């Protein structure tokens, strides 16, 4: 499924070849999840099957919690150093 697949692949490449900042890594994670959900929802429509949409809903909730925890981790990392380097990890 084209749009989801392209979004996932390009987001993965952006994550991997990121040499600019850490926020790009966070964004690439979020958008890879978006691409996966798009592929899933198209298949859910083509099968007329609720299982795909149920999994997509769960994916959305988990992406929210993962975002919250990832940004908490980033803030805890910031607390000791006061800055994020372009290699900040």
């Amino acid at each position: 499924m084209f749009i989801g697949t392209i979004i996932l692949v390009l987001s993965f490449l952006g994550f991997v070849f990121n040499r600019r900042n850490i926020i790009l890594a966070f964004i690439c994670l979020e958008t890879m999840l978006l691409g996966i959900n798009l592929i899933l929802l198209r298949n859910s429509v083509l099968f007329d099957d609720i299982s795909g949409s149920l999994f997509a809903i769960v994916i959305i909730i988990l992406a929210g919690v993962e975002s919250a925890i990832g940004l908490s981790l980033l803030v805890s990392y910031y607390r000791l150093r006061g800055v994020i380097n372009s290699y900040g990890i």
């Binding site: 692949v9 149920l54 919690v65 925890i69």
Partner: protein
């Protein structure tokens, strides 16, 4: 750029091929671009209720898969307790 190009081609092609069921690899890739046809949308009259996607999701999430909802409640609990644990300094 070299690695980006090789990875682009390989990952895109493989992500289109994982969907096929043909034994031959070239046919696997070819099926990806194989929707030259329109789907025929037809009517029937067996659904008398006004049930939409949201209603059906609620129906399966709260009855068939209630366990998944409760585990998700635990995950949200984690999304509260964890941030507080590492962003707040007690005492």
């Amino acid at each position: 750029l070299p690695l980006v190009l090789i990875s682009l081609i390989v990952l895109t092609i493989s992500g289109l091929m994982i969907y096929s069921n043909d034994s031959i690899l070239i046919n696997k890739l070819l099926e990806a671009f194989g929707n030259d046809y329109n789907t025929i949308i037809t009517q029937d009259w067996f659904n008398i209720e006004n049930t939409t996607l949201l209603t059906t999701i609620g129906n399966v999430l709260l009855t068939n898969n209630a366990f998944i909802l409760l585990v998700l409640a635990i995950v949200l609990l984690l999304g509260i307790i964890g941030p507080i644990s590492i962003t707040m300094k007690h005492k």
